[PDB]
């Protein structure tokens, strides 16, 4: 069933004509005002941007000739009674020809011509936002009437008037009393009157245009009050400025424990600033990137592209980049190659910065780790490439047996002090270092003369098993090492073995004797012990025993096992409770108990009849 | 002070001119080619849409003529040797004037003009996709040159050739041998040659426009083979093709246990189908394969979540001819229509689950055992109380007044409760065997009030966040006990003084309870439900303690043993007291990681059996 109608039989017959592409301006205005911007409030964000652009242009016109610089400010006025919003700038302005060519032509931007006329592309090319030519028409999203008083900064220009109802036709005229620059009056729509309120305009400006290059006033009072410290050199910004900027961006009243100021240009233009907070991460921090994109000092509002890896969501800051590709809606182009390389560069930069911070201050980095280790663990368990795995794992800090309590150690320094030819890193998980030292697995492991890391946090063995390799050395837990590795009389021991296997057949698939234990009555070993511990939390007792294979081990030298010999015959009934309690204790010590609430009654009725002789 | 430069001294004196808006097409083509579509592969989809539109138009023309319906289909050809991609449709076709008017004008679409001549808006408006007029120029994102051989369906129109290199200038000519319809040749760019491979084109076609209303062929073979069953009536669609469609959309191989066909027009045009898989939810499950469609083409928003987060366990498709779209044919983020669609879908799915529970007790019970965690998550993440109660109506629990194995909802629980009673009691335990023997349940065995039993995790949190059902508060058994208002008194006080001395740091307050029969001790806190989960979170993630009141049972043998134990083995008596406190904390669920308890238990047991 493979048939096609594709053929090359067609050919040109008549003389070829020639035509020029046209454009339906009415439908273009409809598209811009209805089906371009998801958020209705961006119209001022464009306009303010335009204002800044104009001012930037004026600065060039006052730098090339080297003359005096008058006041350069942007003004927002709100008239609830008239239902209007006014955006005024003292920038270059626009003449008759400039108003007709720029305002009257869709996708025609005077900024692009201005940038191409710089002949340097180093002063205003990085500070001009307008690049499409449709930003102004977003004003028609909310306005049934746009009224522009524009006059140029040229010595002898005239005030000019520009009315448009947004219906594909606009009128122009000569106006008197117009101040140098451009003042746009927007008459709000019936349903868009909410933009004729002080609070809404203030919210939008603090959402989009806080860090414009020029002072910005709303209804009379300046509302910027905070320069963008991510633009100048890191040496020129102080600790107080860093703290204030962190307080603004993170919406928190504390200070940043870590500050990074990255400024790179060889791979791509990145001016980023990041802060790791002093306070412990909050519950909101764990839930999902807390870093705001900026392009020419205006917000992008991605909120979905994740310019920063998810595990690095605990840091707060900004990223500025003039190279990112923006769509017509002035939003980030999803799944862009440039944004992916930006994310990778930022991730590697932050990993390197954390490594240098660890080298610089041991105690401060130890505090940072005990605060934010869950994020690095999540990054390890969620990464794909082994290089990223190792880079994040270099940030881990686990205290080991070879060092005193409370002295955390890295994986790299642990590997730097192993034996000559052992490619094995051993880790043991316990709630506390005291239990780790007194863990049955560690006591069995004491036969081997090696150093073992101690893990106390949740999802830590899971992190180590996901890492699975560091510095070309395999990661094997103590339980896994015990499994993979290959008093009482013999007759009494064997008969006790048979009795326990008979009375624990359903729950234990194999019982054996371990002479490596000294202070623990019993041990539980599993093939994939680390994987089993995590799987048990994801998915009566025989149900888990089927897929767990709880290999039980007993120590004949322990007091309970020794007393079991007389407890099996004198009162065989209590011996069943005793061995069940020993099995449950070994289960709990192994971490293979979903909830110990079931064994409480068994333990209580063991205690009531165990010490009744007293 | 305030510094403002806004004034009103300005005035108009000049003559008012009049101009028409212009648009330079070079920058418009540039914007469409680079800064419009995030994905480079969407262009064929647009082309396919165009093809579909053309075919649709032709169909309507034949409806206007009442003549025989010829074969109409979309053919896709891929030439890796020539590095070209061709899309041919047998639609209406375009004349030279039509080619110039439509192809040569930005934002000018013949589909809208055709719709304005429909005068019914139901015959073809539900199937016409083109609405902007820039879809064709997406072909320039990948093409260094585009040819269009178009012959109109009119009886006597000649073929026309349309060349464009995408630099704002295009040429037209008379073409001979062109069959009826439109054949678009695209010569791929140097860096965009991946579209000259059959595999990539097939993947993109199946991803975006697999459910086009007309047959679609790539390199000769047809890959539709499956009609859009969400458009036909629920009675017409059968179970076999229901299973086939579910397997396609969910990329699974099982059958759907629940199938919902929702079709409404009064609030907004919704044609959706939803499937609940037979298998238990996967770990990845915990766009959710509910991808939004519009005029039988994928929107691929992947961010708005047209369906609530907890309703991610269901698969299927949603179609709406009225959802607003970006110029890039993407969903408008945070739109009122989309939010109302999400609310309507959530309400309809809640109603459907309620109806399924009414019409099948055991099947819905199995489904709840399979997907109860999603409803609990929805209750946890919900904000409106009415939504909270609507989702809670889906919860199934087993109570103390009913035999083991059967589950009931909160509605039928409150239907059988006493009129004077105005609260719902719930107790959390891993199994019903432990719940019946739980010290907290035994404490309320004095009263006859029914109590629900919760086994799965996060049920206590779910009932806590619910906090009300049918204007009835939800009070946990532990909370009810704490809010409530053989070891003679002197000996009991003397023993309790020592217990306070040895448990001063841990047990903030200790008292005697008279409602225990089998459990030596109990641990209670005011925020028991909240604390039991806050402790789990604290031991789970290091993010940003409690005052446990301990109650002893005077009639218990273990507690009675402590008087004679203190005078003989004070150290072992202290060990027993610590073990009793640990057991009470474990039963309360407030215990930490119990690995530390094992050592103390063994140190107790080594000497507690030194009497045989």
């Amino acid at each position: 069933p493979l048939h096609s109608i594709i053929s090359s039989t067609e050919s040109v017959q008549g003389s070829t004509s020639k035509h020029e592409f046209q454009a339906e301006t009415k439908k273009l205005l409809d598209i811009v005002a209805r089906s371009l911007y998801s958020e209705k409030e961006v119209f001022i964000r464009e306009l303010i941007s335009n204002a800044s652009d104009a001012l930037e242009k004026l600065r060039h016109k006052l730098v090339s000739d080297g003359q005096a610089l008058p006041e350069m400010e942007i003004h927002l006025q709100t008239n609830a009674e008239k239902g209007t919003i006014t955006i005024q700038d003292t920038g270059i302005g626009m003449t008759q020809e400039e108003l007709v060519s720029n305002l009257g032509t869709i996708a025609r931007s005077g900024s692009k011509a201005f940038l191409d006329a710089l002949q340097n592309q180093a002063e205003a090319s990085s500070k001009i936002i307008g690049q499409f030519g449709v930003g102004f028409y977003s004003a028609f999203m909310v306005a049934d009437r746009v009224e522009v008083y524009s006059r140029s900064a040229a010595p002898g220009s005239l005030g000019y008037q520009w009315l448009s109802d947004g219906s594909g036709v606009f009128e122009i005229a000569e106006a008197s009393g117009v101040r140098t620059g451009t003042k746009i009056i927007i008459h709000l729509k019936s349903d868009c009157k909410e933009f004729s309120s002080e609070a809404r305009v203030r919210d939008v400006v603090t959402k989009y245009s806080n860090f414009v290059s020029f002072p910005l006033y709303l209804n009379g009072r300046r509302m910027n009050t905070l320069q963008a410290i991510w633009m100048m050199d890191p040496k020129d910004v102080g600790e107080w400025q860093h703290e204030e900027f962190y307080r603004y961006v993170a919406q928190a009243h504390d200070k940043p424990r870590y500050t990074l100021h990255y400024k790179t240009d060889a791979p791509l233009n990145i001016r980023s600033i990041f802060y790791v907070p002093d306070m412990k991460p909050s519950m909101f921090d764990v839930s999902r990137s807390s870093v705001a994109l900026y392009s020419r000092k205006v917000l992008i509002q991605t909120k979905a592209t994740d310019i920063l890896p998810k595990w690095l969501r605990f840091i707060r800051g900004v990223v500025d980049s003039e190279d990112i590709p923006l769509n017509l809606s002035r939003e980030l182009l999803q799944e862009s190659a440039l944004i992916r390389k930006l994310r990778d560069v930022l991730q590697q930069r932050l990993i390197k910065f954390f490594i240098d911070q660890s080298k610089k201050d041991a105690e401060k980095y130890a505090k940072f780790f005990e605060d934010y280790g869950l994020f690095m663990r999540e990054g390890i368990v969620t990464a794909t490439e082994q290089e990223v795995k190792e880079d994040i794992a270099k940030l881990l800090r686990y205290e080991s047996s070879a060092l005193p309590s409370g002295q955390l150690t890295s994986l790299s320094e642990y590997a730097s002090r192993m034996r000559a030819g052992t490619r094995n890193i051993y880790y043991l998980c316990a709630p506390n270092r005291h239990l780790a030292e007194h863990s049955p697995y560690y006591e069995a492991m004491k036969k081997k003369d090696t150093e073992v890391l101690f893990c106390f946090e949740q999802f830590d063995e899971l992190t180590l098993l996901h890492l699975r390799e560091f510095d070309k050395k395999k990661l094997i837990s103590v339980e896994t090492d015990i499994v993979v590795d290959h008093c009482l009389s013999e007759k009494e021991t064997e008969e006790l073995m048979a009795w326990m296997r008979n009375v624990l057949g359903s729950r234990v698939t194999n019982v054996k004797v371990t002479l490596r234990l000294d202070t623990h009555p019993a041990m539980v070993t599993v093939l994939e012990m680390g994987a089993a511990r995590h799987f048990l939390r994801m998915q009566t007792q025989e149900e888990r025993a089927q897929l767990l294979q709880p290999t039980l081990e007993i120590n004949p030298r322990h007091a309970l096992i020794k007393k079991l010999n007389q407890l099996r015959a004198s009162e065989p009934g209590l011996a069943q409770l005793l061995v069940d309690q020993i099995y449950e204790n070994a289960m709990i010590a192994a971490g293979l108990v979903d909830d110990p609430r079931a064994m409480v009654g068994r333990l209580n009725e063991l205690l009531v009849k165990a010490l009744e002789r007293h | 002070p305030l510094h403002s430069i806004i004034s009103s001294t300005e005035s108009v004196q000049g003559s008012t001119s009049k101009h028409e808006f212009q648009a330079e097409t070079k920058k418009l083509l540039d914007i469409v080619a680079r800064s419009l579509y995030s994905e480079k592969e969407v262009f064929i989809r647009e082309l396919i849409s165009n093809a579909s539109d053309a075919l649709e138009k032709l169909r309507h023309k034949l409806v206007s003529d009442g003549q025989a319906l010829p074969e109409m289909e979309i053919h896709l050809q891929t030439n890796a040797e020539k590095g070209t991609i061709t899309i041919q449709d047998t639609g209406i076709g375009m004349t030279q004037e039509e080619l110039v008017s439509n192809l040569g004008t930005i934002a000018r679409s013949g589909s809208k003009a055709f719709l304005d001549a429909l005068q019914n808006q139901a015959e073809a408006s539900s199937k016409i996709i083109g609405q902007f007029g820039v879809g064709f120029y997406s072909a320039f994102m990948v093409a260094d040159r585009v040819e269009v051989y178009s012959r109109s369906a009119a009886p006597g129109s000649l073929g026309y050739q349309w060349l464009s290199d995408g630099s704002g200038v295009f040429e037209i000519a008379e073409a001979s041998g062109v069959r009826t319809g439109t054949k678009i040749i695209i010569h791929l760019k140097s860096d965009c040659k991946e579209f000259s491979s059959e595999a990539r084109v097939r993947d993109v076609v199946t991803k975006y426009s697999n459910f086009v209303s007309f047959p679609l062929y790539l390199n000769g073979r047809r890959m539709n083979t499956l009609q859009a069953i969400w458009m036909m009536d629920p009675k017409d669609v059968g179970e076999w093709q229901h299973e086939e469609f579910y397997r396609y959309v969910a990329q699974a191989h099982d059958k759907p246990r629940y199938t919902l066909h929702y079709k409404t027009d009064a609030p907004l045009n919704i044609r959706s189908i939803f499937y609940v898989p037979d298998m238990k939810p996967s770990m990845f499950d915990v766009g959710s394969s509910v991808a939004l469609y519009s005029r039988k083409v994928l929107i691929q928003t992947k961010a708005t979540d047209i369906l609530p987060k907890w309703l991610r366990f269901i698969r299927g498709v949603v179609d709406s001819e009225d959802i607003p779209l970006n110029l890039s044919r993407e969903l408008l983020q945070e739109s009122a229509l989309i939010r109302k669609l999400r609310d309507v879908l959530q309400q309809r799915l809640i109603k459907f689950f309620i109806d399924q529970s009414k019409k099948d007790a055991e099947k819905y019970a199995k489904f709840f055992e399979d997907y109860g965690l999603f409803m609990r998550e929805g209750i946890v993440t919900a904000t409106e109380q009415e939504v909270k109660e609507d989702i809670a109506k889906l919860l199934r629990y087993e109570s103390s007044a009913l035999p083991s194995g059967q589950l009931t909802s909160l509605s039928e629980y409150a239907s059988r409760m006493r009129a004077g009673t105005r609260n719902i009691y719930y107790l959390c335990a891993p199994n019903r065997h432990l719940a019946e023997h739980s010290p907290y349940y035994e404490a309320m065995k004095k009263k006859d009030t029914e109590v629900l039993f919760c086994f799965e995790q996060f049920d206590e949190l779910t009932l806590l966040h619910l906090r009300e059902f049918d204007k009835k508060k939800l009070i946990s058994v532990e909370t009810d006990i704490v809010v409530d208002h053989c070891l003679s008194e002197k000996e009991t006080e003397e023993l309790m003084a020592w217990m306070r001395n040895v448990l001063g740091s841990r047990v903030t307050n200790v008292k005697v309870t008279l409602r225990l029969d089998t459990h030596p001790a109990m641990v209670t806190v005011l925020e028991m439900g909240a604390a039991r989960h806050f402790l789990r979170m604290q031991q789970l993630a290091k993010t940003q303690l409690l005052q446990p009141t301990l109650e002893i049972n005077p009639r218990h043998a273990l507690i009675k043993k402590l008087n004679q134990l203190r005078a003989s083995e004070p150290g072992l008596a202290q060990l027993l007291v610590d073990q009793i406190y640990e057991n009470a904390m474990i039963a309360a669920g407030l215990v930490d990681d119990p690995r530390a308890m094992v050592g103390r238990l063994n140190e107790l047991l080594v000497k507690a059996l030194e009497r045989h």
């Binding site: 839930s287 994987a531 995590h534 799987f535 994801m538 | 770990m283 996060f458």
Partner: peptide, 23 residues
């Protein structure tokens, strides 16, 4: 198999936001 299960633990803040009003 288990390593690739990538446990979600999503809406992890919502549970604490639920807990807050009770206390």
């Amino acid at each position: 198999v288990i390593k690739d299960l990538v446990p979600d633990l999503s809406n992890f803040y919502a549970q604490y936001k639920s807990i807050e009003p009770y206390l």
